[PDB]
């Protein structure tokens, strides 16, 4: 069977550089001729305990381009009336009996992992849990960086915003250290900057990393500019306003961009990236979000096909 | 004065004019510090050459006396500006910018959480100076920001 | 390709008498032998920003009878927590990458039109936007009037209720002036009556129109009695009660109906049409609502098939 | 040579010219069309008499040239204006205004529910007339209004 | 020997030419040499089932000022809305045993009346009972007109806004016809024009009245311009724009204004009266609001005592 | 001849070394031989747009105690949140005509200020206006420090918790620098460390200050340990654990404590101060809370009267 067949996709720190290669490779390879009935006669679940319709939409969309059936819910808050003692443990054992592969999102850190211990046969994915992992989001990020940069190693990564609590940058940064070279540049406010958490291990594997305050410094020397999202309810209005201007993007700064460069954003956006940017080719976020279908198709593909021929 | 040549700048009557306004600040003024809302001869030489190697903006307003205070509100935006008392082509006063203890009406408080934003009143900060920063503390919320910080958007 | 292929169906004032003929013609023609896999291997979206399960139900139902896949949401109000700066503009660019044809409903006037400027390749439909258009509702109305009257021109249209804010009557009335003859009779309260808005242009094209206060006047001389819905929160309880009795329907008034006549209602109902009416053959509303699948099937059909053979 | 009365303005070398801008409107277009983001000389004839017109406006710009389209768009903000091609102290090109059928990016939809408020989009009001009101039909909410509305707050 | 002792105050029509005339005289006196310990040891239950701060705050302000104390509440949902619960009669009976007076505000026409039939000797007053009544208001408007012009007779009154549903606006007239010689001008949209029956009320009382398109006309002779908040609510989102264009009031319109003229409004104003006005002479709204006190002050005093030595 | 009559109380910086010094002297007296019918016939509108029981209850407690009565409200939503409604200025103007004083609490910096520009002669005080100000608190903290040490000068103050955003904590310092000789110790996480600008404020005032890692150090000389509730809110769900480990206070830490030392806290404490403490000597929190009264008591008395015979 395939290296990654019926293997609970829970955390990126559990996946491997080979698995990763397989995934992305499948993604693009499968991106050429899709089989709108690959996982035919099959049912996928989509338990979205915490709502989120970008990751919900994409996953169910990928699910369909693969001729699969989806049953499930996009639970919001008017069902807070659920709070009562029906544990996820039972919620999963029941649910496990109905399908083939569970796709879940949850508010507490330990979701996906925990259901694993109550589903087994039924391999689960992780659409995002707590402020831990979101393997799928780092996947579409990676595959996308490949597609565009051509290579996935010896890049010039730039990461701006709330690098401190921004789970989309910790997961990407980890996974990137799985390749050689990749020069890292961090750009976040002096109280939203990267934690020694990832830092130490970054040095540990001789991964050249740096830190600056203005994108306008590391601009001529970058390849992928990943814009995170700096939040208002994360820093007091006054300071938020203050430590913001140089934690934003605009077309006027891209003026000296290595044409080979692209601008990404886990999404969504609001203050960060201005719209004039929406034109300059570096603008790849929306397209990046389209790739999310393939990295996600392949994720299931492998997880559901003992072997892949195509 | 027959050197490198062009030919424009012209004074026209008894009126207080503003001569020497930094690129892209003329019209700016006209809308922040309400100058056009009048009914007395105006000739605006936005983008007109000056005898200092630089072409800049010219705001000629006839029939008005601008208080030394009003002048000070120009500072931050248009720096070493100049407003002269002019009567019959003759000058009767040369006014240059200084920093007023208070700026008013135009600036927007950055603090999204400021009653300023949703009430019928007017912007009244405060002015302070530090090495490379000209500080402005809102009279309402009481948060002090920086010249760029407030004077951007 | 077909006259109406991949052509954003946004407003009825943009559609054309020929397109209309095509649509309705397709509708009925396709109403004979359906292909439960016409838009096979395809995914349609169904972004219902404003909830509404009659128009949601039907559309997704039509979507299935055409062997298509549907991904999407029926957003209510417990997601008011969405209010935060994620614009529809981005919501659509992202969403546009995932599918083939978007189906959307929205609270603000300018929905469908606006997404068009951010989807392009992806042709969108309009399940209703603001208090503007609902091309689909006028479509099922038309096709239905044809099916029954046999003809779609030289009819005796009667429109009762809240003709003033009733967007289902402005759109129908417009589209009908696209045919010859059609005698119009309006029947609404003296503060809920039709606006000079449509009126002027009605005269402008020599379209005979009239106005009365009691259905019981224009009864022996009518063909289609379109019952709108007069609302309580639209007129003060006291007046609402007063100016109501002769802005209602009952079997007792249908007593002299030209057998050739049918009674319709955009739906739903509550005070307006009484149930005794539910029997007298003029009662066509529920059946009219069944036709809504075909006019909607064809709408996509064309919008998705470069050419139609069948 | 120098005679009886010291008059006023003469013809400047070259650029665009639109004769006759209504009372308190110069700024109106100057701002609504932002004719200041141009590195060319922006001399602005303001608050000055024109025959019996006690108050008239006139933009004056070097090296620029009003496009046929620009000319159509101001025909609802200045009806009796006049665009022309000024060539080295010698004008030609009588390109006066004329009401268009489209109008872009300037006006605001009075329809509070129109989406042309939140989403970043180009304002688009179609243009037609009655005999007292120029009916401006919305591109987004499709609602009919008149100029005596849309031009307000 | 005063007429108002132990009596009720519910509707305006339930009062007289001299009733008001007494109340107001009291309103002036109490404003002159105020009685502070007037209602000592008394207790007034301000019951606002429908919360209404401004109408509440004041009433109690009077209460307390007059040496009296309060018991009561804001909003009202012992649980939910309209379920199987307590009736108003029952609420009203129990409450009437322990309080000395009853001031209630309800959202149902006739609640204050209904209290009358169940509240024993406790005189109930009305703070607002739906589109029905609101006495104290019309009283403060009235007395304020006296405080300003000196006379309730021979006034060139004018009422702009939403006359149709405006609760303060039907009632003011009703009460001003009790006086001699008054010319009423009705400047409001034809969609919110004066409720017919009242036009008859004035026709039959041989009162001078007329309608208008744009305020400008009457601004000359009008000694009173009582404004009405056209709540964007009752209208279509767009409709509001076309009308609320002249039915507002910039000080620039003021000019013509007679020197004695004053601008009145029940509040709260949003768009009706411009901020320029606030600082001009004729601006009299907030004063009318503050003057309310003495009406209610007097009123309660004229309700709670046999005789009053002023 | 007192300085505070008919004046406002908004910010702390808006006060003086002797202003406080007067207020406090009054705070002691009123605690000694209390004036009960001091504010008889007066009326104070306690307006808490942002509900706040503890800060409310007390203020009114003072009010009532002082022979005065109250008018007012808790929470604030005449309908919903931030829709097209009444402005604060307008709320504030009307309310100012009938009340004698105004005590408001708002969630927007400068609301209390804004009231100043519209409230006429009515002196407005501030119960809390967002992260901006909260005078009365700093006052009760202060006076309480006097009630305890005897002197506001030569104090080894220490402030633990969330100094960064803690509204009570910036203001206390500002006010204590008004006095002579004070050494400030800053024991708090580096993620919530003292807001820079204030460090300058002390640097330039030539005030003795410093930061710290773990309380244990300063426990010796510190005569004041004013604690701050590190609301788990501002932090990541996990983060809270790593720090809030020493920035708490078991009586077991107390030991070293100087005999005069006292533990202060603005409340309400959840995890900051341990229950062991409540029964020990230095526990002074609730007393500080109860002492608040006299500050406000005095304050209102010093605001409402020309002269005061104590
Ligand atoms: Zn502010
Ligand atoms: Zn619009």
Curated annotation (Swiss-Prot), chains A, C, E, F:
GO cellular component: aspartate carbamoyltransferase complex; cytoplasm; cytosol
Top-level taxon in the UniProt lineage: Bacteria
Record's catalysed reaction(s): carbamoyl phosphate + L-aspartate = N-carbamoyl-L-aspartate + phosphate + H(+)
Signal sequence range: none
Sequence positions that bind carbamoyl phosphate: 54-55, 105, 134, 137, 267-268
Enzyme category, top tier: transferase
Annotated residues for binding of L-aspartate: 84, 167, 229
Entry EC no(s): 2.1.3.2
PANTHER family reported for this sequence: ASPARTATE CARBAMOYLTRANSFERASE, ORNITHINE CARBAMOYLTRANSFERASE, MITOCHONDRIAL
Description of how the protein assembles with itself and partners: Heterododecamer (2C3:3R2) of six catalytic PyrB chains organized as two trimers (C3), and six regulatory PyrI chains organized as three dimers (R2).
Function noted in UniProt: Catalyzes the condensation of carbamoyl phosphate and aspartate to form carbamoyl aspartate and inorganic phosphate, the committed step in the de novo pyrimidine nucleotide biosynthesis pathway.
Full protein name: Aspartate carbamoyltransferase catalytic subunit
Species for this entry: Escherichia coli (strain K12)
UniProtKB/Swiss-Prot annotation, chains B, D:
Highest taxon in the source lineage: Bacteria
Gene Ontology MF terms: zinc ion binding
Sorted UniProt keywords: Metal-binding, Pyrimidine biosynthesis, Zinc
InterPro entries listed in its UniProt record: Asp_carbamoyltransf_reg_N, Asp_carbamoylTrfase_reg, Asp_carbamoyltrfase_reg_C, Asp_carbatrfase_reg_C_sf, Asp_carbatrfase_reg_N_sf
Cofactor note: Binds 1 zinc ion per subunit.
A biological process from GO: pyrimidine nucleotide biosynthetic process
Entries under Pfam families matching the protein: PyrI, PyrI_C
Cellular component GO terms, alphabetical: aspartate carbamoyltransferase complex; cytoplasm
Entry binding sites for Zn(2+): 109, 114, 138, 141
Cofactors that this protein relies on: Zn(2+)
Keyword Zinc annotated: yes
Entry's family note: Belongs to the PyrI family.
PANTHER family: ASPARTATE CARBAMOYLTRANSFERASE REGULATORY CHAIN
Quaternary structure and interacting proteins, as annotated: Heterododecamer (2C3:3R2) of six catalytic PyrB chains organized as two trimers (C3), and six regulatory PyrI chains organized as three dimers (R2).
Function statement: Involved in allosteric regulation of aspartate carbamoyltransferase.
Identification of the protein by name: Aspartate carbamoyltransferase regulatory chain
Source organism of this protein record: Escherichia coli (strain K12)
The gene coding this protein: pyrI
């Amino acid at each position: 069977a395939n290296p990654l067949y019926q293997k609970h996709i829970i955390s990126i720190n559990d996946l491997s550089r080979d698995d990763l290669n397989l995934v992305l490779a499948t993604a693009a390879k499968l991106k050429a001729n899709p089989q709108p009935e690959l996982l035919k006669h099959k049912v996928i679940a989509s338990c979205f305990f915490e709502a989120s319709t970008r990751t919900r939409l994409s996953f169910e969309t990928s699910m369909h381009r693969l001729g699969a059936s989806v049953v499930g819910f996009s639970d919001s808050a008017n069902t807070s009336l659920g709070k009562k003692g029906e544990t996820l443990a039972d919620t999963i054992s029941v649910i496990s009996t109905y399908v083939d592969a569970i796709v879940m999102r949850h508010p507490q850190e330990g979701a996906a992992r925990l259901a694993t211990e109550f589903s087994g046969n039924v391999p689960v994915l992780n659409a995002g849990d707590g402020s831990n992992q979101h393997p799928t989001q780092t996947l579409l990020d990676l595959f996308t960086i490949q597609e565009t940069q051509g290579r996935l190693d010896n890049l010039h990564v730039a990461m701006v915003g709330d690098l401190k609590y921004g789970r989309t940058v910790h997961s990407l940064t980890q996974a990137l250290a799985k390749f050689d070279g990749n020069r890292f540049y961090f750009i976040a406010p002096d109280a939203l900057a990267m934690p020694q958490y990832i830092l130490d291990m970054l040095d540990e594997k001789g991964i050249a990393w740096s830190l600056h305050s203005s994108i306008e410094e590391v601009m001529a020397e970058v390849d992928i500019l990943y814009m995170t999202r700096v939040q208002k309810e994360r820093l007091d209005p006054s300071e938020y306003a203050n430590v913001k201007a140089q934690f934003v993007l605009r077309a006027s700064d891209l003026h000296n961009a290595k044409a080979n460069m692209k601008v990404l954003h886990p999404l969504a956006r609001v203050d960060e990236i201005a719209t004039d940017v929406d034109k300059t080719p570096h603008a790849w976020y929306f397209q990046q979000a389209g790739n999310g279908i393939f990295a996600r198709q392949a994720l299931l593909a492998l997880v559901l096909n003992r072997d892949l021929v195509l | 004065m027959t050197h490198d040549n062009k030919l424009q700048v012209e004074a026209i009557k008894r009126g207080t004019v503003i001569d020497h306004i930094p690129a892209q600040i003329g019209f700016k003024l006209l809308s922040l510090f309400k100058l056009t809302e009048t009914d007395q001869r105006i000739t605006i030489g936005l983008n007109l050459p000056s005898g200092e190697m630089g072409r800049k903006d010219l705001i000629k307003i006839e029939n008005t006396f601008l208080s030394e205070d009003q002048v000070d509100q120009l500072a931050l935006y248009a720096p070493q500006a100049t407003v002269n008392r002019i009567d019959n082509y003759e000058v009767v006063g040369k006014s240059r910018p200084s920093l007023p203890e208070r700026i008013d009406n135009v600036l927007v408080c950055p603090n999204s959480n400021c009653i300023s934003h949703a009430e019928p009143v007017s912007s009244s900060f405060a002015v302070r100076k530090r090495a490379n920063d000209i500080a402005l503390k809102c009279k309402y919320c009481e948060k002090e920001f920086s010249h760029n910080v407030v004077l951007a958007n």
